[PDB]
Design a protein around this ligand. Structure first.
Ligand SMILES: Cc1cc2nc3c(=O)[nH]c(=O)nc-3n(C[C@H](O)[C@H](O)[C@H](O)COP(=O)(O)O)c2cc1C
Ligand SMILES: Cc1cc2nc3c(=O)[nH]c(=O)nc-3n(C[C@H](O)[C@H](O)[C@H](O)COP(=O)(O)O)c2cc1C
Lengths: 198, 199
């Protein structure tokens, strides 16, 4: 049995394209693995705080309740990530970057000695053995163009903490009409079917 | 006479590497252009809110909630400020392979359809024109021109979209390798800054 962790980050709630893709992933995964446990963390519904001077200080004198709470949340998020086998991440493109909702999550899980460390061989990620799937929706078409810096960035960040097995699924041209959008979702769903079947 | 807008984003206050670079930039600009006015907005000291579902609604009628009203007023303020200056200095250190969230929130409030960019018969076009931008980016490690630096290309893409195509990049890398290496990195960065100021 595998445990699947789904991280939603869209700020569009019910109208989220990436959220619709994560729902499809969950639907298909539950159908294939009826015993698998799925945990969903909606980073928009339940926001993670912005990494500021006070919080970064906490992650490395007495701590204020705010700092204590943020540290506890960081621990929770990290423990949750390490406890699951399949990590599904919704990462749509907002102003050429990922949603701040997801960025805040990354800023709290990237911690020296906890999710990565340095050895005789150099930097080594500590979140091992995971299978990750990135579901990224975009209004325009950026894949394989100089304007898509989020896919490369996600690969680098995830790799740094140890998640190197990352499948990227894209749904682009969403803002170019119901036809283009519909075909984008269909090809993304086909991509998800492949991941689920793998 | 030119008006310089300096955007600070480090969360390290007085220990900020990028902050120290922006201070040098300011010091040098004041030396070479004694009549220019400098405006500084510290995005850590005076934080911009996170773009959430409610706030994005504020930027496009349906009545706005009190929070959306404030967010819209802030967006207008930030945009008016950006358009009112000639030289835009942006501190953009690398935090977990991305820029600081403090700066990202600022970007999310200044990117507005019909105000900082629009669509014409020529396609998308930025509305923040005639600007000279200078990015000051410090890193603990060394990433320039490698696959681990996605911030430089991202900044060029974002700024260009709103119209700022004239962008100079200044890097200070290897800060995490000790005081000796950091000093040389700071020294080279200051030399690059001198050239931008003298241009
Ligand atoms: C605040 C905001 C900023 C956006 N910025 C961009 C952008 O820079 N480029 C692009 O192609 N689409 C952009 N979009 C369009 C979205 O990427 C597209 O609608 C995506 O499918 C939305 O996914 P969502 O439901 O998952 O979060 C933006 C949408 C919002 C709400
Ligand atoms: C939360 C946080 C994340 C960081 N992430 C990275 C990173 O991914 N790569 C790197 O080379 N340095 C990284 N650094 C090191 C900084 O880039 C370096 O110390 C920089 O000079 C800090 O500038 P600051 O005072 O200007 O904002 C990080 C520092 C902090 C506080």
């Amino acid at each position: 049995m595998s445990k699947v962790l789904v991280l939603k980050s869209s700020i569009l709630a019910g109208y989220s394209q990436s959220g619709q893709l994560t729902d499809y992933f969950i639907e298909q995964w539950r159908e294939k693995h009826v015993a698998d446990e799925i945990t969903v963390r909606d980073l928009a519904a339940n926001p993670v705080p912005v990494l500021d001077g006070e919080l970064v200080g906490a992650m490395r004198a007495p701590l204020t309740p705010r700092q204590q709470d943020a540290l506890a949340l960081s621990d929770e998020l990290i423990a949750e990530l390490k406890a699951h086998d399949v990590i599904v991440i919704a990462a749509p493109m907002y102003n050429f970057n990922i949603p701040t909702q997801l960025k805040n999550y990354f800023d709290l899980i990237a911690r020296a000695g906890i999710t990565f460390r340095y050895t005789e061989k150099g930097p080594e990620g500590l979140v091992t053995g995971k299978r990750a799937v990135v579901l990224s929706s975009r209004g325009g078409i950026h894949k394989d163009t100089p304007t898509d810096l989020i896919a490369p960035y996600l690969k680098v960040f995830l790799g740094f903490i140890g998640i190197t097995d990352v499948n990227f699924v894209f749904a682009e041209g969403i803002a170019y009409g119901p036809e283009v959008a519909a075909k984008a979702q269909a090809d993304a769903k086909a991509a998800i079917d492949s991941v689920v079947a793998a």
